[PDB]
Amino acid sequence: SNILEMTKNYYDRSVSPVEYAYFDQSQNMRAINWNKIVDEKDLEVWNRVTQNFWLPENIPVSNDLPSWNELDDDWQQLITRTFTGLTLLDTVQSSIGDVAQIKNSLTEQEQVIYANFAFMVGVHARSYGTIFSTLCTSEQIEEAHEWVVDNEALQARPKALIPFYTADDPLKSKIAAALMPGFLLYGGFYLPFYLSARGKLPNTSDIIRLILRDKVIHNFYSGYKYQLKVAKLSPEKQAEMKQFVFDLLDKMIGLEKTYLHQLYDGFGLADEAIRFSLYNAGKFLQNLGYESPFTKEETRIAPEVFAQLSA
Amino acid sequence: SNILEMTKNYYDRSVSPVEYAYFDQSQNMRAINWNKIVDEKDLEVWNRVTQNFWLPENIPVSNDLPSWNELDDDWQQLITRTFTGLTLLDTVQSSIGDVAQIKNSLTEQEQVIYANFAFMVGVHARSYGTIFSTLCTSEQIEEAHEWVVDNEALQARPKALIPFYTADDPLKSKIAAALMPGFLLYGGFYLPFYLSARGKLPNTSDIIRLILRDKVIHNFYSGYKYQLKVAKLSPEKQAEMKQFVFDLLDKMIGLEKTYLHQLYDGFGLADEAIRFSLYNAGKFLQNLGYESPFTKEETRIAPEVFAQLSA
Numbered sequence: 001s002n003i004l005e006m007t008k009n010y011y012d013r014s015v016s017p018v019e020y021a022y023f024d025q026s027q028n029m030r031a032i033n034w035n036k037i038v039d040e041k042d043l044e045v046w047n048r049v050t051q052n053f054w055l056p057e058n059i060p061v062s063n064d065l066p067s068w069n070e071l072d073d074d075w076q077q078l079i080t081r082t083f084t085g086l087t088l089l090d091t092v093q094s095s096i097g098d099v100a101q102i103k104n105s106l107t108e109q110e111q112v113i114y115a116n117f118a119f120m121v122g123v124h125a126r127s128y129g130t131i132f133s134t135l136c137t138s139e140q141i142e143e144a145h146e147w148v149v150d151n152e153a154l155q156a157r158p159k160a161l162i163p164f165y166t167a168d169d170p171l172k173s174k175i176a177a178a179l180m181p182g183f184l185l186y187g188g189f190y191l192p193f194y195l196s197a198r199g200k201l202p203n204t205s206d207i208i209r210l211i212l213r214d215k216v217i218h219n220f221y222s223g224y225k226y227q228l229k230v231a232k233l234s235p236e237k238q239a240e241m242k243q244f245v246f247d248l249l250d251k252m253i254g255l256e257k258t259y260l261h262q263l264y265d266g267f268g269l270a271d272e273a274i275r276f277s278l279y280n281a282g283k284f285l286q287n288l289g290y291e292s293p294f295t296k297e298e299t300r301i302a303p304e305v306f307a308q309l310s311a
Numbered sequence: 312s313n314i315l316e317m318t319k320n321y322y323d324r325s326v327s328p329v330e331y332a333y334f335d336q337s338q339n340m341r342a343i344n345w346n347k348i349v350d351e352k353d354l355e356v357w358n359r360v361t362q363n364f365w366l367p368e369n370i371p372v373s374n375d376l377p378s379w380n381e382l383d384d385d386w387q388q389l390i391t392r393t394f395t396g397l398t399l400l401d402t403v404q405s406s407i408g409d410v411a412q413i414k415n416s417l418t419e420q421e422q423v424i425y426a427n428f429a430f431m432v433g434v435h436a437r438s439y440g441t442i443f444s445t446l447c448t449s450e451q452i453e454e455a456h457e458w459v460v461d462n463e464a465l466q467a468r469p470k471a472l473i474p475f476y477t478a479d480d481p482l483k484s485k486i487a488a489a490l491m492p493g494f495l496l497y498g499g500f501y502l503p504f505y506l507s508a509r510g511k512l513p514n515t516s517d518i519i520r521l522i523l524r525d526k527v528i529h530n531f532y533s534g535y536k537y538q539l540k541v542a543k544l545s546p547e548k549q550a551e552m553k554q555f556v557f558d559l560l561d562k563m564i565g566l567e568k569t570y571l572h573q574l575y576d577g578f579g580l581a582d583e584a585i586r587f588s589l590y591n592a593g594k595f596l597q598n599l600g601y602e603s604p605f606t607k608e609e610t611r612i613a614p615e616v617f618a619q620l621s622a
C-alpha cells in the first residue's frame with residue numbers, strides 16, 4: 001500500500017484533440033501545455049522555424065531581369081519547367097504530407113510544428129509564382145504547367161509517396177515526409193545554384209536558400225521523430241523498417257534519375273544534378289540515423305555550386 | 312468552326328494533389344498556379360493573413376505584472392481557466408478543423424490559406440502559454456489544465472463539432488470550421504476585454520486583439536466558401552442546409568450558455584458574457600449569408616467592452 005496513487009495527473013488521463021478525433025473518444029481532451037514541454041527539441045524547432053518566417057515579396061527578384069534576359073528561350077523554358085516541377089512537390093507536401101503527420105505526433109508541440117511546415121511549404125510553392133510573375137511571360141508559365149501535367153517521369157515521383165501519406169502506417173508516412181525535403185527537390189535546386197555560381201539569377205538563389213533554410217529543418221525534424229518511433233519497435237521490426245527505408249530510397253533514386261535525365265540531358269547537367277541529388281540522399285539517410293552507402297565520386301559537387309548551397 | 316482550339320487547357324484535364332490523394336486519380340496532378348488565380352478573394356485573404364503574421368514574443372506581457380498582482384486569487388484563477396479553455400478550442404481548430412478543410416477547397420490557393428489558418432491558430436494557442444509563463448505560478452497553470460479535462464460543460468462544445476471534421480460531409484465540416492472563430496471563443500474573450508476596459512492587463516488585451524484580427528478573417532473566409540458551395544445546391548438542399556446551420560447554432564448556444572454560467576455566475580459576468588456571445592452568433596449567421604434572429608436586448612454590449620473589441 002506504500003505506492004497507491006490518490007491523485008492522477010491530468011496529462012496521463014486525457015488525450016490531445018487529434019487523438020480524440022481519430023483514435024480514442026473514451027477520455028476527455030487536454031489543451032496544449034506550452035509551460036510543461038515533454039521534448040525540449042520541439043521548442044527549439046518551433047522557435048527556429050517561426051523566427052525564420054519569410055515571404056517571397058521580401059526578395060527583389062526584379063533585380064534578376066538583366067541576367068534572365070541574357071538566357072535564351074531554351075534556358076528560360078528549362079528554369080520555368082524545373083521550378084513548376086518543384087511547385088508540384090511543394091503542393092503535395094503542403095496539402096497532403098505535412099498535415100498527415102499531425103495525427104501521428106509523439107508530442108503536443110509536434111502537432112503545431114507540422115501545421116507550421118504545411119504553411120511554410122505553401123510559402124515555398126508560392127515563391128516560384130513570385131519569380132514567374134517577375135521574369136516569365138504568360139505563355140512560358142502556361143507551357144510549364146502543361147509540361148508538368150503531361151510529364152509521366154515527373155508525376156511518378158509524387159505518385160510513389162502520396163500512398164504512404166493516405167495509408168495507416170505512421171512510420172512509412174514519416175519516412176515519406178522526411179524524403180520530400182531530404183532528397184526529392186535537390187535535383188531541381190541544382191539548376192539555380194549552377195546558374196548563380198556563374199553570377200546569373202542571384203536573387204532567385206536567395207529565395208532557394210530561404211526555402212532550403214526551412215527544408216533542412218523539416219528533414220532533420222521528421223528524421224528525429226522517425227528515430228524516436230523506430231526505437232520503440234522489436235529488433236526484428238527495426239531491421240524490417242531499415243530495409244523498407246533503403247528499398248524506398250532505391251526506388252525514388254530510380255524515378256529521380258529518369259526524370260533528371262529527361263529534364264537535363266539536352267543541357268549537359270544530368271550527371272552533375274544526379275551527383276548533387278545522391279549527396280542529399282546520403283544526408284537524408286544520416287538524418288534517419290543510418291550510414292550513407294554512396295561514394296565520394298558519385299556524390300561529387302563542384303566547389304562553386306557547393307558554395308551557393310552552404311551560403 | 313470560327314474558334315480553333317488546337318490544345319485543351321491543362322487546368323481542366325488535371326487535379327490538385329489533394330484531390331488526387333483523396334478523391335480522383337483519373338488524371339495527372341497540376342502544380343498550384345499563383346499567376347492565374349481563379350478567385351481574387353483568395354489572394355486578398357492570403358496577403359492579409361501573411362502580412363498579419365505575429366508571435367506572442369512580440370508583446371511585452373511582463374508590463375502586465377503590476378495589474379495582474381492587483382487581481383485577487385479567484386480572478387487570477389478565472390483568467391487562467393478561461394484562457395486554458397480557449398487554448399483547448401485553438402488546439403482542436405489547429406490540429407483537426409483547419410487541416411480538414413484543405414481537401415474540400417474550391418480553389419488551389421484556399422488549400423494554402425487553410426494551412427496558414429492551422430499554423431496561426433497554433434500561434435493563438437501558444438500565446439496563452441506565453442501569458443501564463445509571464446504571469447501565472449506552476450500551480451495555477453497545472454490547476455487550469457486539470458479543470459479543463461474535468462469540466463464536462465466545457466468539453467461538450469468541441470465534442471459537438473469534431474465529428475463534422477472527421478465525417479465526409481464537406482459543407483457541415485465548413486459550418487463547424489466557421490462556428491469556431493465566429494462564435495465559440497467570444498464567451499471567453501469577453502473576460503480580457505471586460506478587464507482592459509477597467510484598466511487591467513492592457514498588454515494581454517493586445518495579444519487578444521492580434522488573435523481576433525486573425526479569427527475575424529477565418530470566420531469571414533469559411534463563411535464566404537460555405538456560401539459559394541451552398542449556392543450551387545437545389546432550393547430543397549439549400550433549405551435543408553439552412554435548417555442544419557440554425558439547428559447546430561441552437562445546440563452550440565445551449566452548450567455555451569451552460570459553460571458560461573458555470574464559468575462566470577460566481578463573478579456576476581455570465582449574463583454580460585452571454586449577450587457578447589449572442590452578438591457574435593448573429594455576426595456568424597450574417598457571414599454565412601443568413602439573417603440574425605437575436606434581439607437588441609439579448610445582444611447588448613457595454614460601450615467600453617465594444618471599444619476594446621473594435622480597437
Ligand SMILES: [Cl-]
Pocket residue numbers: 093121180181215218
Ligand atoms: Cl518539404
Ligand SMILES: [Cl-]
Pocket residue numbers: 093098117121177180181218219
Ligand atoms: Cl516537410
Ligand SMILES: [Cl-]
Pocket residue numbers: 404432491492526529
Ligand atoms: Cl479559429
Ligand SMILES: [Cl-]
Pocket residue numbers: 404409428432488491492529530
Ligand atoms: Cl479557422
Ligand SMILES: [Cu+]
Pocket residue numbers: 093117121181214215218219
Ligand atoms: Cu518541408
Ligand SMILES: [Cu+]
Pocket residue numbers: 404428432492525526529530
Ligand atoms: Cu481561426
